[PDB]
Amino acid sequence: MYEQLKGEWNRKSPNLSKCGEELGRLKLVLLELNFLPTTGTKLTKQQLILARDILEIGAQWSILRKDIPSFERYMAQLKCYYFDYKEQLPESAYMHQLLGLNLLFLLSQNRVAEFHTELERLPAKDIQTNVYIKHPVSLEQYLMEGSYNKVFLAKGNIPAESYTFFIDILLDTIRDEIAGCIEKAYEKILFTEATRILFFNTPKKMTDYAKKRGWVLGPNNYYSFASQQQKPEDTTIPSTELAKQVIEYARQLEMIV
């Protein structure tokens, strides 16, 4: 059924002459009929199971090439096909792994709102099944409070693969959160502590932070401006707008209603 697929799907195609074939096949599956459901031809499952297989394998080999902007296309379309249902058999090799991977990606962009709004679509597999799904929510739970040592040490235990392109940027956004937290007006920190608090012994990446953000480290002092008092004694702005206000009170008080 217009397959032309069984060549280098299982075997790895490290940027082989493949993306052209994916483009061809997606054009063709567009041509054949409904690439997105319009409702009909229910018994016709081959154009459906084929479609979901194509999309999932494309995303699986897309994470390898690190197309973060494109990756969302495939993941969204897989989400579309996981809910028309009809009578299609749901189970695949994935339908768990792909959701756990989507979950990690969504967390690493540091947008936990939609992360939490997506937990409202799988009602009984959360704390019971699919270790692929128990690991990410466990990670978010640990990130909810300040305990981070376990998060760093959890790298030894990974569900399926390296997942590197999703956990490395997670460690970087942890960098960001810690930096955004350790602010507020505190005292001098010597050139050892804030370096050894996170990970790095004494490289220039701490220097990159220093010359990237503020805290001029002159007399060993890292200082962040966390006073921002401003607003002095400024009766004049009242003296205008309050006069406007009172004139209005007296306006709509004696005029005939």
């Binding site: 909810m144 409070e145 505190y186 005292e187 502590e193």
Partner: protein, 97 residues
């Protein structure tokens, strides 16, 4: 139809504990916050307290070298302009009625 909200509650448990502590004292060492919260490590107590400060749970600051946490006190809200605003809104409503 409300199970998922309460499934995440333990962390806000520890948050409530530290908030009541914040309201109790003013100047307190970290050598006791974790000790009386059953938290064994005093390194992560820094982190949980700092986050609690970030989102506005408690108003204190931290002296990382010294080891004490003190909370600022801001008073005399009568002298500011905000009560005038709170009253003006109600004046408008009553005239509307």
């Amino acid at each position: 139809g409300t199970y998922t909200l309460i499934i995440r509650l333990r962390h806000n448990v520890i948050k409530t504990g530290v908030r009541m502590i914040s309201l109790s004292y003013s100047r307190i060492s970290l050598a006791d916050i974790a000790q009386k919260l059953q938290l064994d490590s005093p390194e992560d107590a820094e982190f949980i307290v700092a986050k609690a400060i970030r989102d506005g749970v408690i108003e204190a600051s931290i002296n990382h070298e010294k080891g004490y946490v003190q909370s600022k006190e801001m008073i005399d809200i009568y002298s500011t302009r905000e009560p005038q605003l709170a009253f003006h809104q109600r004046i408008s409503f009553c005239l509307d009625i």
